[PDB]
């Protein structure tokens, strides 16, 4: 169930990174706080995505280096 | 961009870009986990050697083919083989290349649907198309008619085609192929004292079969000659010395093709299933099929088979028809050459199963109009 | 000449490279911070009607879910790259293991202690 | 040892005479000022030790640039301080790999002579092109105009 | 910190810190109580001289080895030997140093468990690991394959290894070793008149064996030559004068290795147990094992053994394979050099048996994953 595992993990993340949200029974201050929670969560996700981009750049560079070393080794 | 013409096969995976003459990378399709314990630390020992790497470390592995008879029995290993083929033998990411797999006739549907689902979800190709392994071998010969006998290593199938119109009611698929001949050779070698048991030694018996065996023109005369003289005994050096001498096992191993009663199979040989496949066709296209009999696949490379088969069919067929057997020297890669030609056509460029189509109808799209 | 001055040159090169790497990393951190501040839309959380606040929060939650999906996809891609480069490193070791193991240096027995024992305090370097 | 050698290197040439006097205090009878395997074995046996002459000749050959198997006076000092070992682990492999990866500005997986020239210009230390040539020779083993990662390790082997 | 690479052995204890070229302290493993009465008062006479001290006062002691054949038969004496090794020959308290003992293959479990229990309770080391004496000798050669014949002084064992994967079903352990050769030499010296009986004179016979004996390239020709000429008779001066002359006892003592019928043992020589150990391996790794036969251990230092063994194996093996015998000049300390290399590895740094693990599972932890 590996592909099913990935799909279910993603769907859970939809319900995990975003829990059950009810903005109707909350006062103005609580709504503002929850909105800022969403905003800062998105900011953290942007930070993580940027980190992933940097790591991917490093991975590509090192992969090229390893290809060169492998070619040299023969 | 260019298309990837992969050809899973069973025994040798042949792949390469569309539009060339020969496959770029040809390597056995075996995945072998190590079986002993391993004491050296830091040696960098992997958990599974696939492809041609496991034909060099086969002394301490347990090789196991992921494709039994055309069908695929172990999907994880097949996925591993495909991943190796794409990334290490061709070094082209599949995100930017259409693929053209090949499949034997009369195979289970679930196999084909799982194949397309893997290609679209895991490797995430732009578009893939599945083609019957015999039509390609007919492409490579440059014909447009003819009945092709594609005796691979997994399964032998015999698809007749006329004027481009395939005859679906005349396909005769038989499950005797190169692997059963290897097992039978390994079983008759025991009559001289040589015992091969390990799954690694099956490769040695396969090499013996490839290098020494040949198909006899007349079976009884050869059996009588090999039992009196000694002009047939050819010797062969094992991977460690101790040469062996093969006597009348030379032409008895591939004789199983024409007498499947040797390995206990009921059906008739490849010399008579072709005639039966012809006789199921209409009465007016039998002359053309008689004159354009095509051989393909690896197992039809035995020295002297294109004469034995012609003699047998001429015995069966009416005396007036001319029997001709097309045996191109590039028999082994005939299916892949045909696949390259088909993928290089402009008229074929709109038959691919585009990814958006798969997203709308699911994996069952392959049985639909996009065949 | 001798390798002492050459070793000094090499160490100078090493120090310069380390300083450049640290400087580049700091620049990357600052640029990343500024870019991240740019990416996320600023909050406007004043003077908004209660129902309007709820609707805006729901829109923010939807966008958060979208970003969650996108970043999960990017994370999966980076994970695949990590696995693939780990396999590449495995292959690198396979082609570079075998006899290529550095060895320690202990063949020299203690010499300073014997020098001090047999010459008193005349050995001052070690 | 090597660190102490570099530290005391800032003194005058009379320290060489002091070390010759110390070696005389050890094994008086020296006449040439060079430590051969005979004198080294004798002094270590007096100490109660026995280093292999293979080690001694390997140390001789490692610093041997002219291939003479002998030592000049400063080369004699280098051989004398080679009798002890302190350079353990050669700085840090990971940081060295990071520096070498940052060296490749064009990210071609190699370090060519031009990149070496740029880095040396960035260093600014008083250098001559002869030093650059020696560094390139010690770094580019196959003389392909580039530095391999294995060749980079060999060039940075035993380097802190 | 640094690791202590001890190597108990049987006959010579070799120890030293990890990362060097040679063991720091090498001394015989004998513990000898005095046997006479003793009349001088205040002479400071101890109750047991161990190690190299008892090889100088051996005239009035009764030396007795605490290790018979790999296994340890007298645990108190072995504890005394270890205590001496740690405190007086290396002068490093064991509370601050990991230890790496070595053990012959196929030894009793109780021996290994008692060894680890002693190291953890009495000496109280931080972490200890037990390794098979042949894998280390393979490390020292810088190989990763090969079949190593480690003919020590206690027991001769022959462990084949391929690509880092040890073959546990092909280990052939034989209990003929240097000690039995010493006893046989002491027994055949009586044919000229020299009688050595005391356990102290066994050391003199051992010295004779080390300095004079050599392995004959061809046994019958040497027996015929020594019986006609007198070019072989080499003399040797006892510790008190009265030189002795060894005739054809020179090559008859170490010949027992290739014909264990001399000392009444049934099994085949070290020239044929290697071939049998190879033939038990798989058919595809026999060429590599043939080409990378490794010698180690003290007893393989006889002048002329690397040629006799190669001649014998070439006689046994198929004519096509190349037989090569690796005999490094640093044979005696090969196991310890390999131990130093293994202890100096970074990948190995997490395989030690940490003390908290022993506290949780008892001494039986050694048979578990931490082997
Ligand atoms: N030169 C040869 N002579 C005889 N048999 C061969 C020869 N080459 C291949 N074969 C047999 O054919 C098989 C390979 O068939 P192949 O056409 O690769 O199968 P597939 O259709 O799966 O690609 C091998 O297993 C071998 O037994
Ligand atoms: N130079 C030599 N020539 C012949 N035999 C030797 C020589 N050196 C040692 N031996 C034999 O080898 C034994 C020492 O073997 P060793 O490798 O120390 O055993 P262990 O494996 O217990 O350390 C001695 O008892 C001696 O009989
Ligand atoms: Ca010189
Ligand atoms: Ca560059
Ligand atoms: Ca270079
Ligand atoms: Mg085929
Ligand atoms: Mg030993």
PDB file of C-alpha atoms in Angstrom, chain B residues 60-166:
ATOM      1  CA  UNK B  60      26.806 -15.145  -3.137  1.00  0.00           C
ATOM      2  CA  UNK B  61      23.335 -14.064  -4.331  1.00  0.00           C
ATOM      3  CA  UNK B  62      20.004 -15.769  -4.904  1.00  0.00           C
ATOM      4  CA  UNK B  63      18.922 -14.460  -8.299  1.00  0.00           C
ATOM      5  CA  UNK B  64      15.185 -14.499  -8.955  1.00  0.00           C
ATOM      6  CA  UNK B  65      13.514 -13.326 -12.134  1.00  0.00           C
ATOM      7  CA  UNK B  66      10.553 -10.990 -11.537  1.00  0.00           C
ATOM      8  CA  UNK B  67       8.721 -12.125 -14.709  1.00  0.00           C
ATOM      9  CA  UNK B  68       7.687 -15.771 -14.889  1.00  0.00           C
ATOM     10  CA  UNK B  69       5.754 -16.333 -18.142  1.00  0.00           C
ATOM     11  CA  UNK B  70       5.116 -12.966 -19.696  1.00  0.00           C
ATOM     12  CA  UNK B  71       3.084 -12.027 -16.632  1.00  0.00           C
ATOM     13  CA  UNK B  72       4.767 -10.212 -13.758  1.00  0.00           C
ATOM     14  CA  UNK B  73       4.651 -12.036 -10.438  1.00  0.00           C
ATOM     15  CA  UNK B  74       6.633  -9.699  -8.156  1.00  0.00           C
ATOM     16  CA  UNK B  75       5.736  -6.059  -8.646  1.00  0.00           C
ATOM     17  CA  UNK B  76       8.256  -4.556  -6.240  1.00  0.00           C
ATOM     18  CA  UNK B  77      11.169  -6.217  -8.035  1.00  0.00           C
ATOM     19  CA  UNK B  78       9.821  -5.153 -11.419  1.00  0.00           C
ATOM     20  CA  UNK B  79       9.584  -1.574 -10.179  1.00  0.00           C
ATOM     21  CA  UNK B  80      13.189  -1.824  -9.025  1.00  0.00           C
ATOM     22  CA  UNK B  81      14.239  -3.113 -12.445  1.00  0.00           C
ATOM     23  CA  UNK B  82      12.467  -0.259 -14.211  1.00  0.00           C
ATOM     24  CA  UNK B  83      14.013   2.304 -11.879  1.00  0.00           C
ATOM     25  CA  UNK B  84      17.468   0.912 -12.588  1.00  0.00           C
ATOM     26  CA  UNK B  85      16.815   0.882 -16.329  1.00  0.00           C
ATOM     27  CA  UNK B  86      15.735   4.506 -16.413  1.00  0.00           C
ATOM     28  CA  UNK B  87      18.252   6.043 -14.062  1.00  0.00           C
ATOM     29  CA  UNK B  88      21.508   4.082 -14.387  1.00  0.00           C
ATOM     30  CA  UNK B  89      21.533   2.410 -17.803  1.00  0.00           C
ATOM     31  CA  UNK B  90      20.081   5.363 -19.735  1.00  0.00           C
ATOM     32  CA  UNK B  91      20.458   8.227 -17.233  1.00  0.00           C
ATOM     33  CA  UNK B  92      17.366  10.052 -18.485  1.00  0.00           C
ATOM     34  CA  UNK B  93      14.715  11.132 -16.056  1.00  0.00           C
ATOM     35  CA  UNK B  94      11.321   9.729 -17.108  1.00  0.00           C
ATOM     36  CA  UNK B  95       9.545  13.034 -16.475  1.00  0.00           C
ATOM     37  CA  UNK B  96      10.482  14.186 -19.982  1.00  0.00           C
ATOM     38  CA  UNK B  97      10.093  11.130 -22.178  1.00  0.00           C
ATOM     39  CA  UNK B  98       7.247   9.016 -23.568  1.00  0.00           C
ATOM     40  CA  UNK B  99       7.576   5.269 -23.078  1.00  0.00           C
ATOM     41  CA  UNK B 100       6.516   2.335 -25.260  1.00  0.00           C
ATOM     42  CA  UNK B 101       6.315  -0.902 -23.293  1.00  0.00           C
ATOM     43  CA  UNK B 102       5.688  -4.288 -24.892  1.00  0.00           C
ATOM     44  CA  UNK B 103       3.413  -7.100 -23.745  1.00  0.00           C
ATOM     45  CA  UNK B 104       2.788 -10.664 -24.840  1.00  0.00           C
ATOM     46  CA  UNK B 105      -0.599 -11.542 -26.355  1.00  0.00           C
ATOM     47  CA  UNK B 106      -3.373 -13.025 -24.223  1.00  0.00           C
ATOM     48  CA  UNK B 107      -1.905 -11.788 -20.946  1.00  0.00           C
ATOM     49  CA  UNK B 108      -3.980 -11.024 -17.840  1.00  0.00           C
ATOM     50  CA  UNK B 109      -5.534  -7.586 -17.803  1.00  0.00           C
ATOM     51  CA  UNK B 110      -4.428  -6.763 -14.267  1.00  0.00           C
ATOM     52  CA  UNK B 111      -0.797  -7.035 -15.343  1.00  0.00           C
ATOM     53  CA  UNK B 112      -1.221  -4.404 -18.052  1.00  0.00           C
ATOM     54  CA  UNK B 113      -3.290  -2.081 -15.860  1.00  0.00           C
ATOM     55  CA  UNK B 114      -0.763  -2.271 -13.021  1.00  0.00           C
ATOM     56  CA  UNK B 115       2.021  -1.589 -15.514  1.00  0.00           C
ATOM     57  CA  UNK B 116       0.365   1.592 -16.737  1.00  0.00           C
ATOM     58  CA  UNK B 117      -0.508   2.676 -13.198  1.00  0.00           C
ATOM     59  CA  UNK B 118       3.115   2.299 -12.122  1.00  0.00           C
ATOM     60  CA  UNK B 119       4.416   4.168 -15.155  1.00  0.00           C
ATOM     61  CA  UNK B 120       2.014   7.043 -14.529  1.00  0.00           C
ATOM     62  CA  UNK B 121       2.227   7.323 -10.744  1.00  0.00           C
ATOM     63  CA  UNK B 122       5.721   6.302  -9.666  1.00  0.00           C
ATOM     64  CA  UNK B 123       7.891   7.297 -12.620  1.00  0.00           C
ATOM     65  CA  UNK B 124       5.394   9.955 -13.758  1.00  0.00           C
ATOM     66  CA  UNK B 125       6.017   9.704 -17.507  1.00  0.00           C
ATOM     67  CA  UNK B 126       4.264  12.106 -19.905  1.00  0.00           C
ATOM     68  CA  UNK B 127       2.582   9.351 -21.944  1.00  0.00           C
ATOM     69  CA  UNK B 128       2.970   5.588 -22.372  1.00  0.00           C
ATOM     70  CA  UNK B 129       1.681   3.054 -24.883  1.00  0.00           C
ATOM     71  CA  UNK B 130       1.588  -0.747 -24.732  1.00  0.00           C
ATOM     72  CA  UNK B 131       2.069  -2.781 -27.901  1.00  0.00           C
ATOM     73  CA  UNK B 132       1.851  -6.483 -28.711  1.00  0.00           C
ATOM     74  CA  UNK B 133       5.289  -8.037 -29.058  1.00  0.00           C
ATOM     75  CA  UNK B 134       4.586  -9.644 -32.429  1.00  0.00           C
ATOM     76  CA  UNK B 135       3.379  -6.643 -34.421  1.00  0.00           C
ATOM     77  CA  UNK B 136       6.689  -4.941 -33.712  1.00  0.00           C
ATOM     78  CA  UNK B 137       8.648  -7.946 -34.945  1.00  0.00           C
ATOM     79  CA  UNK B 138       6.580  -7.704 -38.099  1.00  0.00           C
ATOM     80  CA  UNK B 139       7.448  -4.008 -38.393  1.00  0.00           C
ATOM     81  CA  UNK B 140      11.160  -4.742 -38.208  1.00  0.00           C
ATOM     82  CA  UNK B 141      11.015  -7.147 -41.155  1.00  0.00           C
ATOM     83  CA  UNK B 142       9.593  -4.375 -43.322  1.00  0.00           C
ATOM     84  CA  UNK B 143       6.624  -6.542 -44.272  1.00  0.00           C
ATOM     85  CA  UNK B 144       2.939  -5.904 -43.862  1.00  0.00           C
ATOM     86  CA  UNK B 145       1.663  -9.504 -43.904  1.00  0.00           C
ATOM     87  CA  UNK B 146       3.000 -12.747 -42.550  1.00  0.00           C
ATOM     88  CA  UNK B 147       2.665 -14.962 -39.499  1.00  0.00           C
ATOM     89  CA  UNK B 148       5.310 -14.269 -36.872  1.00  0.00           C
ATOM     90  CA  UNK B 149       6.528 -16.870 -34.366  1.00  0.00           C
ATOM     91  CA  UNK B 150       8.093 -14.918 -31.498  1.00  0.00           C
ATOM     92  CA  UNK B 151       9.716 -17.575 -29.337  1.00  0.00           C
ATOM     93  CA  UNK B 152      11.053 -15.490 -26.479  1.00  0.00           C
ATOM     94  CA  UNK B 153      12.444 -16.704 -23.186  1.00  0.00           C
ATOM     95  CA  UNK B 154       9.195 -16.590 -21.259  1.00  0.00           C
ATOM     96  CA  UNK B 155       6.446 -17.517 -23.702  1.00  0.00           C
ATOM     97  CA  UNK B 156       6.157 -18.478 -27.374  1.00  0.00           C
ATOM     98  CA  UNK B 157       3.270 -16.869 -29.254  1.00  0.00           C
ATOM     99  CA  UNK B 158       2.305 -16.998 -32.913  1.00  0.00           C
ATOM    100  CA  UNK B 159       0.333 -14.017 -34.237  1.00  0.00           C
ATOM    101  CA  UNK B 160      -0.831 -14.103 -37.882  1.00  0.00           C
ATOM    102  CA  UNK B 161      -1.348 -10.791 -39.651  1.00  0.00           C
ATOM    103  CA  UNK B 162      -2.609  -9.990 -43.136  1.00  0.00           C
ATOM    104  CA  UNK B 163      -2.489  -6.610 -44.890  1.00  0.00           C
ATOM    105  CA  UNK B 164      -2.234  -4.948 -41.493  1.00  0.00           C
ATOM    106  CA  UNK B 165      -5.421  -6.579 -40.182  1.00  0.00           C
ATOM    107  CA  UNK B 166      -4.570  -8.838 -37.259  1.00  0.00           C
TER     108      UNK B 166
END
